[PDB]
Homo-oligomer: 436 residues x 2
Amino acid sequence: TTNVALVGLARDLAARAETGKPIRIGLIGAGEMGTDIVTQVARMQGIEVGALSARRLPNTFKAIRTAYGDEENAREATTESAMTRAIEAGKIAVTDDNDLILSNPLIDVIIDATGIPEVGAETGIAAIRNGKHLVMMNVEADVTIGPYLKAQADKQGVIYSLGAGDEPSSCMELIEFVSALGYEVVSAGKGKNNPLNFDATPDDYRQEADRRNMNVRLLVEFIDGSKTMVEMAAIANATGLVPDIAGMHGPRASIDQLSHTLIPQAEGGVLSKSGVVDYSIGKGVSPGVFVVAKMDHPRLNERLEDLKIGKGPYFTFHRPYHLTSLEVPLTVARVVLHGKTDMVPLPKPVAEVCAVAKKDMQPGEHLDAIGQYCYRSWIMTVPEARAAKAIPCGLLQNGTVIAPIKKGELITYANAAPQPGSRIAELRALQDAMLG
Amino acid sequence: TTNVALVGLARDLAARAETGKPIRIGLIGAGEMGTDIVTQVARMQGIEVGALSARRLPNTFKAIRTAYGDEENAREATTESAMTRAIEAGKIAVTDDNDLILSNPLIDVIIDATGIPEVGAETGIAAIRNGKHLVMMNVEADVTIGPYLKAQADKQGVIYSLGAGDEPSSCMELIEFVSALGYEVVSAGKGKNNPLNFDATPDDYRQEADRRNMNVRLLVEFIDGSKTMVEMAAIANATGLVPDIAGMHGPRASIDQLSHTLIPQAEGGVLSKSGVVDYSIGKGVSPGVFVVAKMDHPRLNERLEDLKIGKGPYFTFHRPYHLTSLEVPLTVARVVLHGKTDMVPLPKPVAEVCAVAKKDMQPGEHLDAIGQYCYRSWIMTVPEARAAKAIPCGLLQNGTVIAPIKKGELITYANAAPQPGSRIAELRALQDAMLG
Ligand SMILES: O=CN(O)CCCP(=O)(O)O
Ligand SMILES: [Mg+2]
Ligand SMILES: [Mg+2]
């Protein structure tokens, strides 16, 4: 199929296949991301989906039919013996009970692809308790309780990673390159073609969501900035880069303008200092990620100028693609074959994803969910978040409004209360104790 | 300096530095590329230049003065005991005797940065004979005798690699990624901003060479196509990708047109078949390298289209930079720390860099050198090369014309004779005997 000789990670995956025992993924969630992963794995060597769960059993069969064209690879399992039988018979065992997957002895690595943060919290800690590696796609959960999950993974001798293919992990590839070379990372982040619309709600997008089948919440959280705030917080929390101002600058800049824009004001850009996470509004940046780096030696500056990388001392490194869920099996391969993580949070977070009201709300109302009507994410430094008593955005779904809140106002422990009994609130309390 | 926490390779280098015994490079050649490597290593952790040689000892001191601003780090050594003392004192030992570097017990890896293929052949086999890893920057030598060097490296238990940062090795990063994902590699290569000029000579470039203080042969070999032929042959001989036609198509195509141009004729492109090395003439491809890949599943096509990566089933993956000599220390780090090569030739070459005359020549004339007046490189498949009895281009410097040759004609064992005594012709004979 590939037309090429096997090299690097491809060759390692071919050698694994030759052992007769593939790397086996337990995949939790059969929606769009999950369905993508089944499809992607079916063309790789040495890596298989052993079992697939969803809240409703029909969805597992649906994912598998979309991947293969029919449901013949699927076999329902309601017990461990049935599941292990199915896997050894070369079937994908399907179930609506996540615990059968999380506890099966043949499963090497867990991927949660449900897009539900509370669920990413629940399944993540259970995967670690059961002695399985854990590949996290729920960035909303990672930026809330990632440090805690990583510490628990270390105690059990397993690996925790964000999955490759999304902007934060793609951007870590560039960051590792620039910093291994000893260069200053001035700014890093992602682009957007068009201005954000912070007032967006599902009323503006229901029509498009319906025609494209897709979850209207995704459009909304994309357009209102929330996903951008979350992705940039994950980069910050893995590096020590910080937002320069709450919400970031988000200037207008094409790909060719980043290196004169997301740089210090002293050198003509918009930043108060070097070492930031930010994003741009303009052409040619998306669908990838970037790092603006500085050169510290005149010879290195000259060499990059001769190669037409730019005009120094600031230079833009672009990765012009990210394939989302399709890259996540490469993380699985590196984790199991090489014992390497693609991306972990630092022990001490430097940014918090906070939230701002999208409309006026009164005491007794409930906050809804990201990508809906009540609030949108807003990145702050930890010290500014704490000073303002901001509630982490991952805690807010179905939270209670306790004092009047006006449009544009920060959501805080003074004006709202999270549902106290969430797994995610419980794990975040444990994280806060561990840090203190 | 970097503004970021240590991750990945950057972390592995810092951990090496904490052992107090850095990875030590033996660097042969104090000119431009060698001076770049001294400068670049000086900003990194865990890796140092232990020793540096040049034909004329003053040029070692000159390279050191450029990198550091003074010669305090240099110490002259003409014996093993003096070189080892200098390295232990934290100096870069400088010498005019390559054999001292090739045989010093404290040197881990050899890099030949002279740009002379004969010397890359000579120091290459010597490095391997002395039990040292070998990073080759001389792509002209690698395409001539690489399979032999690789086989001898394997016999000695050391690693052979092309150095990162040049088009062939940068392109291998993309090929590894697409092929690990199970995707079809349709075409791979590099771009040039402007059309080739096959008739170029140093007469045309002496003013640019003079004002840029650079070797006029490098401009000529760039413009007349020779460097592109060599670089594409390296990719082909590492992958099994082949030139579609002798010389390659080299169509007019911007970055945004690659995926409708370097694809099969049946789908509107220029190629007779999928699985090729080629290049483009047009805007936005250089500096950098590309792979055109094909999707063979509707869901994968649909995901790449929704991400705006292109319109399927063909998609362009671009790495919009390559830093030349600056990335070579990354190869050195991967080789020593992880035992991984960045790029090796396959055991059976599929392409040959041959040569065509730039002017009419008479029996008894000598061929000059690449980037001068007499000849320019031209990629062919191995079977076509053999059928024409073509001489590998790397063997031709100072060769003798034995039958009349017309401008544009292939140089073959029927109309020319290499200098027989070269280490490079001697090693090539051994490669041919190994492959017989
Ligand atoms: O991984 C994919 N994305 O982040 C796309 C979400 C749209 P945005 O880039 O507008 O937040
Ligand atoms: Mg994303
Ligand atoms: Mg090159």
